[PDB]
């Protein structure tokens, strides 16, 4: 349900995104900070995917910098989002009538980015305390959806999945398929370490990297050292 959305970590896995286009025509595929087509060329860190289900007309509310009921009481993306978005109109599965999809309706103040609020306590809209019983100025937060068929697209159920993946390649874990050639040294060679690209001469090095401390950098802020992924050596790019 939208008010308690799941979240699943992805790690240590060659991840392709070719497969997912094999779906019913996505009602939405936006990608906010990276083009969807070139998603098999990058190595990420800690890809995170978290999912829920909402109503039709509210799908355009899942985007940075918007306001509205879902966006301020149930789920809020931050302003500098960096990830993709999917939604694909499940009405063959989630409608019969169904009444175990829930969503919040009242709250004191808006959420904070990427925060889950799960509590079910009586909302108190007044100055006088409630003793856990509904009444005047004493309501219940949640409400059911009731997805019956033949409500038209506006009120029809909708699955949603959002991917957020931080994009500076700290020690990389998840990235798409690509072969691996034997590395050559002391020759001007096109290289592509884990996601970098460019030409240089890869040599041996004397620097010492801490276990968390993966690629070095220089004054003008350009990569000039790198931990080779398979054989964890330290190289110098010139």
């Amino acid at each position, epitope marked *: 349900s939208v008010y308690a959305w799941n979240r699943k970590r992805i790690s240590n896995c060659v991840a392709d995104y070719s497969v997912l286009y094999n779906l019913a025509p996505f009602f939405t595929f936006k990608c906010y900070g990276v083009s969807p087509t070139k998603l098999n060329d990058l190595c990420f860190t800690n890809v995170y995917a978290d999912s829920f289900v909402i109503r039709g007309d509210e799908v355009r509310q899942i985007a940075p910098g918007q306001t509205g009921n879902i966006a301020d009481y149930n789920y809020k993306l931050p302003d500098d989002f960096t990830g993709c978005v999917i939604a694909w109109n499940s009405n063959k599965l989630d409608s019969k009538g169904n009444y175990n999809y829930l969503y919040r309706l*009242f709250r004191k103040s808006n959420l904070k980015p990427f925060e889950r609020d799960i509590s079910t306590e009586i909302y108190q*809209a*007044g100055n*006088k305390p409630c003793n856990g019983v509904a*009444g*005047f*100025n004493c309501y*219940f937060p949640l*409400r059911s959806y009731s997805f019956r068929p033949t409500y038209g697209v506006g009120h029809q159920p909708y699955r949603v999945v959002v991917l957020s993946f931080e994009l500076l390649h700290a020690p990389a874990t998840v990235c798409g398929p690509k072969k691996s050639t034997n590395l050559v040294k002391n020759k001007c060679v096109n290289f592509n370490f884990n996601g970098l690209k460019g030409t240089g001469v890869l040599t041996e090095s004397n620097k010492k990297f801490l276990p968390f401390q993966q690629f070095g950098r220089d004054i003008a802020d350009t990569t000039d050292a790198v931990r080779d992924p398979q054989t964890l050596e330290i190289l110098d790019i010139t």
Partner: antibody
Amino acid sequence: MQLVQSGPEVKKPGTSVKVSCKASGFRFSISAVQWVRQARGQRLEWIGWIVVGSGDTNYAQKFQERVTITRDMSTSTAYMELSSLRFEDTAVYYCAAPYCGGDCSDGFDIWGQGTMVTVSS
Amino acid sequence: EIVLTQSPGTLSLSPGERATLSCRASQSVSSSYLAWYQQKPGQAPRLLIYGASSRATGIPDRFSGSGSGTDFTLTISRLEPEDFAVYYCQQYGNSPWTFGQGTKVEI
């Protein structure tokens, strides 16, 4: 801060009537609206109340097969329908809601001007 | 069903005097919800003392209200010629929410 009600209207017995309550000047997404009928020179009588956002209703036992209190967020109004009118239903119908900005006012201190309906032939 | 018996029926002070009313109840009602109202003839009513002790906004300090449990009173300090109306007492603690009978204050 005010409620504006519909206008006077006379019906024949057996029909049904629909009354409406405007809302303007405050935050309506939290409040509740109740309906009170008063005949001429008599006491006040209760009918039922509705919470706006949730839509839940509650009714008096006597008014159990004749009232459908529904609202509409879009235009910010609350409606009431009375069915199978009889001679005893001729009175003045009021509409009240707490003042509610950030917090509600713990008491119905906004009262509409009241509308009249005469069941005659 | 809560039944409220507002007594006395009619009270007849001269202006400048001290007035009292009553809302004796059948069972007990939470003091959280009980309100007095003032109904001028030909008007909608208005809210005087909500919550059984607190005055509503924009109301002269003459009106007090008090009491809990099953007895609640409203006292007007001095009677000026615009306080002559009919006063109702309404509980909305538990369903149904029911009113009083009225109490006409005259000259």
